[PDB]
């Protein structure tokens, strides 16, 4: 139906080497014919933004786009979320939800196991 054409998959976080802040993985597909922005992700575990990673360097963004027939990818070496502000280290063993909210569609909440370094 109109405003939920966009599926994820691939969600989880390395558990990181930080008691504050941490990386999420996850991958936005979007099966319809228009694109869509990402445009912010909410959780109570902290704050999250969104960065494009260049060469090993990052880059933190408002808006990523989506697009239409395709997919947004957000893994080890490439684009990622960061979660800020967290109380303690994340383990394995626990999870992290959050909600990816668009531009031009529903929100889409995702669970994010937290895994092996």
């Given at each position: 139906?109109?405003?939920?054409?966009?599926?994820?998959?691939?969600?989880?976080?390395?558990?990181?080497?930080?008691?504050?802040?941490?990386?999420?993985?996850?991958?936005?597909?979007?099966?319809?014919?228009?694109?869509?922005?990402?445009?912010?992700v909410t959780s109570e575990a902290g704050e999250v933004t969104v960065h494009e990673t260049i060469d090993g360097t990052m880059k933190e963004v408002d808006r990523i786009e989506v697009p239409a027939h395709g997919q947004l990818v957000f893994k080890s070496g490439g684009?990622?979320?960061?979660?800020?502000?967290?109380?303690?280290?994340?383990?394995?063993?626990?999870?992290?939800?959050?909600?990816?909210?668009?531009?031009?569609s529903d929100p889409v909440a995702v669970k994010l196991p937290v895994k092996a370094a």
């Amino acid at each position: 139906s109109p405003g939920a054409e966009l599926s994820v998959d691939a969600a989880y976080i390395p558990q990181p080497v930080s008691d504050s802040m941490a990386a999420g993985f996850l991958t936005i597909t979007n099966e319809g014919d228009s694109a869509d922005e990402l445009t912010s992700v909410t959780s109570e575990a902290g704050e999250v933004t969104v960065h494009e990673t260049i060469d090993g360097t990052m880059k933190e963004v408002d808006r990523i786009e989506v697009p239409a027939h395709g997919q947004l990818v957000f893994k080890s070496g490439g684009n990622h979320l960061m979660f800020e502000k967290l109380k303690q280290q994340p383990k394995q063993g626990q999870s992290v939800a959050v909600e990816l909210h668009f531009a031009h569609s529903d929100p889409v909440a995702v669970k994010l196991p937290v895994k092996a370094a």
